[PDB]
Amino acid sequence: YRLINCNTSAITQACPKVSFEPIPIHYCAPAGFAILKCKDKKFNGTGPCPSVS
Amino acid sequence: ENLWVTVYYGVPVWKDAETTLFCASDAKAYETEKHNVWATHACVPTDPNPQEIHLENVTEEFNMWKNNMVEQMHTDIISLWDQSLKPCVKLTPLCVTLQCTNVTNNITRTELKNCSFNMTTELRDKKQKVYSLFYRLDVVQINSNKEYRLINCNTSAITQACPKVSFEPIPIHYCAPAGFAILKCKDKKFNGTGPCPSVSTVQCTHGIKPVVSTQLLLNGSLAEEEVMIRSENITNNAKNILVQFNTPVQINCTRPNNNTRKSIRIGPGQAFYATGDIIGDIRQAHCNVSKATWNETLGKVVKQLRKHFGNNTIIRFANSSGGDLEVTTHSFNCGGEFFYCNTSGLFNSTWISNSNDSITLPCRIKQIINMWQRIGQAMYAPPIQGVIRCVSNITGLILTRDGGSTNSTTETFRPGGGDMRDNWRSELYKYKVVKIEPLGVAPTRCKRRVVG
Amino acid sequence: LGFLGAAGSTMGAASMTLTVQARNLLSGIVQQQHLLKLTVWGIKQLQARVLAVERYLRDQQLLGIWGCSGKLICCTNVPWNSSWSNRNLSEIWDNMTWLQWDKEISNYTQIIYGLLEESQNQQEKNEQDLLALD
Amino acid sequence: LGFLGAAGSTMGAASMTLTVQARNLLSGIVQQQHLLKLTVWGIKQLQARVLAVERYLRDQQLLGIWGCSGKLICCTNVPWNSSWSNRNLSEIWDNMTWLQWDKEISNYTQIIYGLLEESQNQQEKNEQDLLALD
Amino acid sequence: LGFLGAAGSTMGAASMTLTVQARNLLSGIVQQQHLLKLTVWGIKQLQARVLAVERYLRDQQLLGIWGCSGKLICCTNVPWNSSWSNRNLSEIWDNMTWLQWDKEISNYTQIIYGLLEESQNQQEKNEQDLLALD
Ligand SMILES: *[C@@H]1O[C@H](CO[C@@H]2O[C@@H](C)[C@@H](O)[C@@H](O)[C@@H]2O)[C@@H](O[C@@H]2O[C@H](CO)[C@@H](O[C@@H]3O[C@H](CO[C@H]4O[C@H](CO[C@H]5O[C@H](CO)[C@@H](O)[C@H](O)[C@@H]5O)[C@@H](O)[C@H](O)[C@@H]4O)[C@@H](O)[C@H](O[C@H]4O[C@H](CO)[C@@H](O)[C@H](O)[C@@H]4O[C@@H]4O[C@H](CO)[C@@H](O)[C@H](O)[C@H]4NC(C)=O)[C@@H]3O)[C@H](O)[C@H]2NC(C)=O)[C@H](O)[C@H]1NC(C)=O
Ligand SMILES: *[C@@H]1O[C@H](CO)[C@@H](O[C@@H]2O[C@H](CO)[C@@H](O[C@@H]3O[C@H](CO[C@H]4O[C@H](CO[C@H]5O[C@H](CO)[C@@H](O)[C@H](O)[C@@H]5O)[C@@H](O)[C@H](O)[C@@H]4O)[C@@H](O)[C@H](O[C@H]4O[C@H](CO)[C@@H](O)[C@H](O[C@H]5O[C@H](CO)[C@@H](O)[C@H](O)[C@@H]5O)[C@@H]4O)[C@@H]3O)[C@H](O)[C@H]2NC(C)=O)[C@H](O)[C@H]1NC(C)=O
Ligand SMILES: *[C@@H]1O[C@H](CO)[C@@H](O[C@@H]2O[C@H](CO)[C@@H](O[C@@H]3O[C@H](CO[C@H]4O[C@H](CO[C@H]5O[C@H](CO)[C@@H](O)[C@H](O)[C@@H]5O)[C@@H](O)[C@H](O[C@H]5O[C@H](CO)[C@@H](O)[C@H](O)[C@@H]5O)[C@@H]4O)[C@@H](O)[C@H](O[C@H]4O[C@H](CO)[C@@H](O)[C@H](O)[C@@H]4O)[C@@H]3O)[C@H](O)[C@H]2NC(C)=O)[C@H](O)[C@H]1NC(C)=O
Ligand SMILES: *[C@@H]1O[C@H](CO)[C@@H](O[C@@H]2O[C@H](CO)[C@@H](O[C@@H]3O[C@H](CO[C@H]4O[C@H](CO[C@H]5O[C@H](CO)[C@@H](O)[C@H](O)[C@@H]5O)[C@@H](O)[C@H](O)[C@@H]4O)[C@@H](O)[C@H](O[C@H]4O[C@H](CO)[C@@H](O)[C@H](O)[C@@H]4O)[C@@H]3O)[C@H](O)[C@H]2NC(C)=O)[C@H](O)[C@H]1NC(C)=O
Ligand SMILES: *[C@@H]1O[C@H](CO[C@@H]2O[C@@H](C)[C@@H](O)[C@@H](O)[C@@H]2O)[C@@H](O[C@@H]2O[C@H](CO)[C@@H](O[C@@H]3O[C@H](CO[C@H]4O[C@H](CO)[C@@H](O)[C@H](O)[C@@H]4O)[C@@H](O)[C@H](O)[C@@H]3O)[C@H](O)[C@H]2NC(C)=O)[C@H](O)[C@H]1NC(C)=O
Ligand SMILES: *[C@@H]1O[C@H](CO)[C@@H](O[C@@H]2O[C@H](CO)[C@@H](O[C@@H]3O[C@H](CO)[C@@H](O)[C@H](O)[C@@H]3O)[C@H](O)[C@H]2NC(C)=O)[C@H](O)[C@H]1NC(C)=O
Ligand SMILES: *[C@@H]1O[C@H](CO)[C@@H](O[C@@H]2O[C@H](CO)[C@@H](O[C@@H]3O[C@H](CO)[C@@H](O)[C@H](O)[C@@H]3O)[C@H](O)[C@H]2NC(C)=O)[C@H](O)[C@H]1NC(C)=O
Ligand SMILES: *[C@@H]1O[C@H](CO)[C@@H](O[C@@H]2O[C@H](CO)[C@@H](O[C@@H]3O[C@H](CO)[C@@H](O)[C@H](O)[C@@H]3O)[C@H](O)[C@H]2NC(C)=O)[C@H](O)[C@H]1NC(C)=O
Ligand SMILES: *[C@@H]1O[C@H](CO)[C@@H](O[C@@H]2O[C@H](CO)[C@@H](O[C@@H]3O[C@H](CO)[C@@H](O)[C@H](O)[C@@H]3O)[C@H](O)[C@H]2NC(C)=O)[C@H](O)[C@H]1NC(C)=O
Ligand SMILES: *[C@@H]1O[C@H](CO)[C@@H](O[C@@H]2O[C@H](CO)[C@@H](O)[C@H](O)[C@H]2NC(C)=O)[C@H](O)[C@H]1NC(C)=O
Ligand SMILES: *[C@@H]1O[C@H](CO)[C@@H](O)[C@H](O)[C@H]1NC(C)=O
Ligand SMILES: *[C@@H]1O[C@H](CO)[C@@H](O)[C@H](O)[C@H]1NC(C)=O
Ligand SMILES: *[C@@H]1O[C@H](CO)[C@@H](O)[C@H](O)[C@H]1NC(C)=O
């Protein structure tokens, strides 16, 4: 047999001590900017959200 | 007496200095072609409105051979070349004992070799033989059946350039940072470097393209008058001389070879793109020059050199004496492949003291290169499959010494472009950046409130 | 007059429009504008933008300690010393560019700066001790 | 009212607390806070901190050449042109949010800025030539 | 007295020369000054220069909303609350270093800042509504 990747691309083993568990990563705005979040529950599609934070 | 001192924020004074600059180029190729080696993948786009202001009553002294804008240009392009080659296929298992034989010429110029070797395949356990082709001088003999060797494996490494990288020079503006300004000279006859009377303070330079040429500059800028002569030092013959063309000579170079992309997988994914069998005859590369248009340009140059160089001596135009075949021939990257058209045919003319035929030059192609004498890492040029034509304007000349003639007469300047930084000086002879100082104190009877 | 229009003109005419010169320098350069962004141009852009503000703020820190936080022209209560220049009122303002004047005080330009902080601010903001509330 | 509390309120009520909006923006984002530090987050942190000050200082450079170095509200000696808006005193201040007003002058907003530097500073700081010492 | 000369001296003597301390900090460090420039020192130089201006501008943003754009010493119209300190006029100024005082208000130092923006600027720049033109 044959490794399927050797036919197309290279290969590099992932490090054993690397944790692949997803943790919460906040995205916060820089200075002079602000992230507006919609508080309206039924936000069908994308339109004018009346309840903004 | 009874005069006070007063502060002024916004004063126009400056001192000669140099700092970091940046690229500026508008929307050029993006989708139809991308991955450019010079504009990278994204640079700061220039505004269509040109930032220009005419300065009056000012006569700032420029300098060109001491200007540091060409120094940062020289070093920027170098670090940019390596940055666009680091993420591409390395060609290390290409240094194996090559067994080659001359190409099929009906048992009878040669210049190329139908060579072979065996490399790594997708599996490191297995090996594979493939027959490709190579160019002369890219290979030099080792010690029947000819067995050859890549010339670079003797000295430095090798890494193939990426196939989707565009090697076409596009205009790259050098614009000044904040608190600085690039002064451009507007005086037409700017002999040497002195006090240019007509100055303009512009924020972004003009469309400067990084033409990598040798002996003969292409696509340069010029603004009228006699063919300008510039030299860091006119009396010293040893110093190089930059020459600018009042009008360009339209030249065309091309290779007639109809090649084919032969991709062979080395290792897991990488593929080595080599030359297959050449279809539809074999011919030598050439560059045409308008014979009638060149005789007028060599005449205008010798005319303005005359009042510059005694106007009594004899003109002796010869081939680039000495040097290396890459530094004496008109070396340049065009259409992907690297041409080296024979210069020796142009400067054979000698003129002194009072449908149409066109002179052509034999040229050869080279795939292994490491330009500007950089011995760190070399690169392989994949042969561009199909047709090739260059068709560029020539606008400059690079001429060097004429021996150590002790008085007497008889001398000119044979072509040499030993340095790559001088190539960029043909565009930056008029530019110099200055450190703006917005602070300026001056006295005047004038005081604010007494107590506060 | 769009920028440095009076670089070669008289110090008086240059003093008539010095706002323009100040406006463009901090703002100027249009700095505002494969997947990586670690290229040689971006690093030359960032440091070119750092000295942009760190040369602006190097100068704006001086005017703040001179009572000139938001004025392009302060008249300061520091007397002029005759050793710095011997030329009369209309002798310099009607004859020299700012370029010529910058080299004529560049020798003793630092001596002026140190004295400007003392009389216009180090003493003036103190003189209100007896006048603020009394 | 902790931040943008009057984004939807009247221009008058928003003008009552505009200090708050100004305080948080320059300071905000808590920027202050294997061995390498060349990660993708650090480079996005640094450039996000550069525009932080280079957008602040882009605005603070304008107020300095308007006599408003340290005032949140300057009344400027520039007359209002009727072409910019035809609405009366209480017609806009008791009816429009600042959002609506920003789009109603965004067309001729640059025309105002150029004129503000001329009359409030380019001429005012010059008018003291005959009044400073006399 | 070349820098921090009165760090250990009285708050009064330190208040006599506080210009010096202010001058050196923003300017100081002489930041101004193989082919690569991606070295470990250059990256420690750039970020050290970023907090240089982003700690300066963090403080200069406060004085601007206090009427102190270009003054080292403002007397502010905010009354002093007795709970912050019980010591008399000459009790603190003739006895404590600024070091000791910084720890004695560090508890309620933020309470002062919030009140300074309200009376000295949030109300003062508003009090001109009836006095600007009338
Ligand atoms: C530059 O250099 C490259 C590389 O060439 C290298 O050296 C040559 C000698 C060869 O070994 C290459 O493999 C090697 O990489 C040149 O590219 C090659 O050029 C040569 C020129 O001769 C081409 O050789 C011809 O190949 C013909 C087809 O063979 C192909 O397939 C073979 C297996 O296929 C079998 O079945 C098919 C039908 O489905 C049959 O057609 C085939 O014969 C086989 O039975 C495979 O092994 C080959 O490698 C190749 O891929 C082959 O028919 C030709 O041989 C005939 O005719 C020749 C004249 O045209 C004559 O000179 C030969 O002697 C030979 O006559 C006899 O034919 C019998 C048929 O059965 C055979 O059994 C006998 O043994 C044979 N006589 C003896 C003894 O020799 C050629 O061999 C080769 O195909 C090219 N590369 C490829 C695609 O492999 C390139 O041309 C050079 N540059 C230029 C432009 O010149
Ligand atoms: C000094 O200045 C001079 C100024 O002249 C510089 O000299 C030359 O200036 C020329 C000005 O036209 C430049 O010419 C361009 O050439 C490119 C070549 O790209 C071709 O090949 C690419 C890759 O090959 C693929 O396709 C080919 C088939 O062509 C195939 O065989 C291969 O296997 C492979 O698949 C292709 O990506 C590319 O599409 C093209 O085929 C050419 O792209 C430029 O196109 C313009 O002109 C052509 C011909 O008239 C026209 O068809 C184009 O129209 C539109 O449609 C095509 C086809 O879809 C599309 O590709 C285009 O994007 C357009 O949408 C378009 O108008 C152009 O011909 C030349 O590169 C330049 N450099 C050289 C070689 O000298 C000189 O370089 C400067 N100084 C020096 C010495 O460096
Ligand atoms: C880029 O291209 C240029 C193109 O010039 C190229 O320059 C070549 O440089 C090489 C090496 O430096 C030259 O190589 C040799 O030159 C030999 C010299 O000629 C001898 O024999 C003469 C008879 O030749 C006839 O043609 C010559 C021109 O070459 C011409 O001057 C003669 O008049 C004659 O018609 C002989 O006359 C001459 O000297 C006598 O006459 C001269 C002129 O009257 C007089 O002044 C002297 O006092 C004396 O009386 C001299 O003895 C040449 O022989 C040699 O090979 C030739 O013959 C072979 C075999 O048949 C041919 O294959 C070959 O093509 C030649 O005809 C060889 O050529 C070369 O001449 C230069 N130019 C070329 C190509 O001709 C650069 O090197 C190129 N750059 C690179 C990167 O390589
Ligand atoms: C562009 O750059 C070039 C650079 O060369 C500038 O070119 C100038 O050209 C002139 C041409 O005359 C030169 O003039 C002479 O240069 C000599 C070089 O000195 C060499 O020898 C010295 C001593 O060595 C031995 O030989 C000498 C030969 O004269 C004997 O005298 C001596 O006893 C020894 O036996 C070495 O020390 C030195 O390192 C060199 O190897 C000078 O020696 C010579 O000096 C004469 O003239 C002087 C000036 O009047 C005078 O003071 C002396 O006493 C003596 O008479 C003379 O200078 C220039 O030197 C050369 N410049 C430079 C930099 O060397 C060119 O000017 C410039 N562009 C311009 C402006 O056009
Ligand atoms: C600005 O100031 C500088 C330097 O002055 C210093 O700074 C100021 C602030 C004060 O603190 C001064 O006390 C400082 O000294 C001036 O620089 C001068 O430049 C000229 C020209 O380059 C120098 O002249 C030199 O002359 C040398 C020859 O000396 C001859 O005379 C002596 C004395 O009699 C004699 O002993 C000797 O034998 C010679 O006959 C010469 O070799 C050298 O190449 C040079 O030409 C001068 O020395 C410099 N100043 C001093 C005092 O060092 C600027 O000129 C000044 N500019 C302005 C606009 O004011
Ligand atoms: C969320 O709900 C809103 C309604 O509250 C939707 O808006 C309306 O959507 C319909 C259907 O998409 C639109 O009608 C269609 O418009 C298209 C052009 O966009 C036209 O080609 C069709 O013929 C048809 O008229 C309607 O115009 C649109 N707006 C209003 C005011 O009714 C919305 O689409 C929903 N989706 C979202 C945004 O999540
Ligand atoms: C990679 O190519 C090389 C050649 O550059 C291979 O080495 C040997 O090359 C010779 C060249 O003639 C081959 O010729 C054979 O020789 C034998 C015995 O002399 C003969 O019986 C055959 O008819 C033929 O002429 C030879 O096969 C080849 N190998 C040996 C064992 O000598 C090399 O093997 C190739 N691949 C690698 C690296 O294994
Ligand atoms: C451009 O033209 C100007 C003249 O408008 C040239 O300036 C003059 O150039 C000559 C020859 O280079 C100088 O004379 C020589 O000076 C050297 C020292 O540099 C001396 O060793 C020689 O004996 C001879 O005297 C001359 O001094 C110089 N200046 C003036 C005012 O005439 C200039 O060289 C030309 N080249 C440029 C700058 O592009
Ligand atoms: C460079 O070489 C290529 C490949 O040989 C040339 O492309 C070929 O051009 C011809 C022109 O007629 C094409 O037409 C015909 O194709 C049929 C069917 O394969 C064939 O029987 C005819 O003899 C004729 O070749 C041909 O398809 C095309 N490609 C191939 C595979 O040969 C190209 O023309 C040469 N140079 C240029 C750019 O003109
Ligand atoms: C070549 O030299 C001749 C004379 O040596 C030039 O003719 C003029 O000669 C006079 C007297 O010697 C000079 O004063 C003039 O300056 C010379 N003309 C000029 C305009 O330079 C002749 O002009 C020179 N070559 C050319 C064509 O410029
Ligand atoms: C092939 O070309 C080389 C070039 O040096 C030559 O030495 C060799 O004799 C040539 N062989 C044949 C048979 O053409
Ligand atoms: C270059 O090619 C063009 C194509 O029209 C031709 O007109 C011109 O004469 C050529 N020039 C030379 C001498 O190569
Ligand atoms: C002019 O300069 C002299 C010194 O050269 C000075 O004494 C005089 O006071 C100046 N004139 C005026 C207007 O004071």
mmCIF file of N, CA and C in Angstrom, chain D residues 27-67:
data_model
loop_
_atom_site.group_PDB
_atom_site.id
_atom_site.type_symbol
_atom_site.label_atom_id
_atom_site.label_comp_id
_atom_site.label_asym_id
_atom_site.label_seq_id
_atom_site.Cartn_x
_atom_site.Cartn_y
_atom_site.Cartn_z
ATOM 1 N N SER D 27 -8.604 55.502 25.386
ATOM 2 C CA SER D 27 -8.213 54.548 26.422
ATOM 3 C C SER D 27 -8.668 53.107 26.212
ATOM 4 N N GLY D 28 -9.881 52.961 25.692
ATOM 5 C CA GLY D 28 -10.516 51.668 25.524
ATOM 6 C C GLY D 28 -9.963 50.568 24.644
ATOM 7 N N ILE D 29 -10.126 49.362 25.173
ATOM 8 C CA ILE D 29 -9.737 48.109 24.553
ATOM 9 C C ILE D 29 -8.824 47.284 25.412
ATOM 10 N N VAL D 30 -8.411 47.836 26.548
ATOM 11 C CA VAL D 30 -7.497 47.134 27.438
ATOM 12 C C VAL D 30 -6.281 46.648 26.652
ATOM 13 N N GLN D 31 -5.669 47.554 25.892
ATOM 14 C CA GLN D 31 -4.525 47.225 25.091
ATOM 15 C C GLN D 31 -3.378 46.983 26.004
ATOM 16 N N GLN D 32 -3.317 47.760 27.073
ATOM 17 C CA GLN D 32 -2.130 47.635 27.909
ATOM 18 C C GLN D 32 -1.643 46.200 28.112
ATOM 19 N N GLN D 33 -2.572 45.276 28.324
ATOM 20 C CA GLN D 33 -2.197 43.889 28.562
ATOM 21 C C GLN D 33 -2.353 43.018 27.324
ATOM 22 N N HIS D 34 6.200 27.753 24.888
ATOM 23 C CA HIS D 34 7.061 28.362 23.882
ATOM 24 C C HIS D 34 7.380 29.810 24.254
ATOM 25 N N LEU D 35 8.545 30.288 23.813
ATOM 26 C CA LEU D 35 9.106 31.553 24.269
ATOM 27 C C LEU D 35 8.854 32.720 23.320
ATOM 28 N N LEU D 36 8.451 32.460 22.078
ATOM 29 C CA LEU D 36 8.331 33.523 21.089
ATOM 30 C C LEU D 36 7.130 34.419 21.387
ATOM 31 N N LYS D 37 7.139 35.606 20.772
ATOM 32 C CA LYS D 37 6.034 36.556 20.860
ATOM 33 C C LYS D 37 5.661 37.072 19.474
ATOM 34 N N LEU D 38 5.912 36.265 18.443
ATOM 35 C CA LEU D 38 5.678 36.633 17.052
ATOM 36 C C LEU D 38 4.342 36.104 16.537
ATOM 37 N N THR D 39 3.380 35.895 17.430
ATOM 38 C CA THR D 39 2.146 35.204 17.095
ATOM 39 C C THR D 39 1.207 36.114 16.300
ATOM 40 N N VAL D 40 0.190 35.491 15.696
ATOM 41 C CA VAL D 40 -0.779 36.211 14.877
ATOM 42 C C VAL D 40 -1.619 37.170 15.718
ATOM 43 N N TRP D 41 -1.782 36.896 17.016
ATOM 44 C CA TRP D 41 -2.568 37.794 17.858
ATOM 45 C C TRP D 41 -1.786 39.052 18.221
ATOM 46 N N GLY D 42 -0.491 38.909 18.509
ATOM 47 C CA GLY D 42 0.307 40.065 18.880
ATOM 48 C C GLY D 42 0.428 41.080 17.761
ATOM 49 N N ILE D 43 0.520 40.605 16.516
ATOM 50 C CA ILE D 43 0.630 41.525 15.388
ATOM 51 C C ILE D 43 -0.710 42.198 15.112
ATOM 52 N N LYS D 44 -1.820 41.497 15.358
ATOM 53 C CA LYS D 44 -3.124 42.142 15.265
ATOM 54 C C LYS D 44 -3.376 43.074 16.440
ATOM 55 N N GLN D 45 -2.694 42.848 17.563
ATOM 56 C CA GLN D 45 -2.812 43.751 18.702
ATOM 57 C C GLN D 45 -2.051 45.049 18.454
ATOM 58 N N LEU D 46 -0.838 44.953 17.905
ATOM 59 C CA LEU D 46 0.000 46.137 17.731
ATOM 60 C C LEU D 46 -0.601 47.101 16.714
ATOM 61 N N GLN D 47 -0.985 46.594 15.538
ATOM 62 C CA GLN D 47 -1.561 47.474 14.526
ATOM 63 C C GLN D 47 -2.921 48.007 14.957
ATOM 64 N N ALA D 48 -3.682 47.223 15.724
ATOM 65 C CA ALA D 48 -4.925 47.741 16.284
ATOM 66 C C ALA D 48 -4.659 48.856 17.287
ATOM 67 N N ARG D 49 -3.508 48.814 17.966
ATOM 68 C CA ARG D 49 -3.112 49.895 18.860
ATOM 69 C C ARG D 49 -2.512 51.086 18.119
ATOM 70 N N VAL D 50 -2.030 50.893 16.891
ATOM 71 C CA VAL D 50 -1.446 51.995 16.131
ATOM 72 C C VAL D 50 -2.535 52.907 15.575
ATOM 73 N N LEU D 51 -3.549 52.330 14.925
ATOM 74 C CA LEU D 51 -4.690 53.127 14.494
ATOM 75 C C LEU D 51 -5.463 53.705 15.673
ATOM 76 N N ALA D 52 -5.376 53.084 16.854
ATOM 77 C CA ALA D 52 -5.974 53.672 18.050
ATOM 78 C C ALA D 52 -5.475 55.089 18.261
ATOM 79 N N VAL D 53 -4.158 55.272 18.217
ATOM 80 C CA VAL D 53 -3.614 56.597 18.466
ATOM 81 C C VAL D 53 -3.565 57.397 17.177
ATOM 82 N N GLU D 54 -3.475 56.730 16.031
ATOM 83 C CA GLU D 54 -3.356 57.479 14.792
ATOM 84 C C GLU D 54 -4.706 57.897 14.227
ATOM 85 N N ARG D 55 -5.811 57.409 14.795
ATOM 86 C CA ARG D 55 -7.120 57.996 14.531
ATOM 87 C C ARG D 55 -7.501 59.026 15.581
ATOM 88 N N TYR D 56 -7.089 58.809 16.835
ATOM 89 C CA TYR D 56 -7.219 59.845 17.853
ATOM 90 C C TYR D 56 -6.431 61.088 17.458
ATOM 91 N N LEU D 57 -5.133 60.924 17.190
ATOM 92 C CA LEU D 57 -4.291 62.061 16.834
ATOM 93 C C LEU D 57 -4.655 62.658 15.481
ATOM 94 N N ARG D 58 -5.344 61.907 14.617
ATOM 95 C CA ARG D 58 -5.864 62.509 13.396
ATOM 96 C C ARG D 58 -6.951 63.532 13.703
ATOM 97 N N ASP D 59 -7.755 63.289 14.744
ATOM 98 C CA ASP D 59 -8.804 64.228 15.131
ATOM 99 C C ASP D 59 -8.269 65.336 16.033
ATOM 100 N N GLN D 60 -7.429 64.989 17.014
ATOM 101 C CA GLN D 60 -6.878 65.986 17.926
ATOM 102 C C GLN D 60 -5.996 67.008 17.218
ATOM 103 N N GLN D 61 -5.466 66.681 16.037
ATOM 104 C CA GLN D 61 -4.706 67.668 15.277
ATOM 105 C C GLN D 61 -5.615 68.748 14.704
ATOM 106 N N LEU D 62 -6.888 68.424 14.472
ATOM 107 C CA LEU D 62 -7.826 69.402 13.929
ATOM 108 C C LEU D 62 -8.267 70.415 14.980
ATOM 109 N N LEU D 63 -8.564 69.954 16.200
ATOM 110 C CA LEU D 63 -9.013 70.863 17.250
ATOM 111 C C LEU D 63 -7.909 71.822 17.678
ATOM 112 N N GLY D 64 -6.648 71.409 17.541
ATOM 113 C CA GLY D 64 -5.549 72.275 17.926
ATOM 114 C C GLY D 64 -5.436 73.505 17.047
ATOM 115 N N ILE D 65 -5.745 73.365 15.758
ATOM 116 C CA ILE D 65 -5.684 74.492 14.832
ATOM 117 C C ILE D 65 -7.047 75.167 14.740
ATOM 118 N N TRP D 66 -7.900 74.933 15.738
ATOM 119 C CA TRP D 66 -9.195 75.595 15.850
ATOM 120 C C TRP D 66 -9.367 76.291 17.194
ATOM 121 N N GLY D 67 -8.289 76.424 17.965
ATOM 122 C CA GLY D 67 -8.368 77.031 19.274
ATOM 123 C C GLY D 67 -8.971 76.147 20.336
#
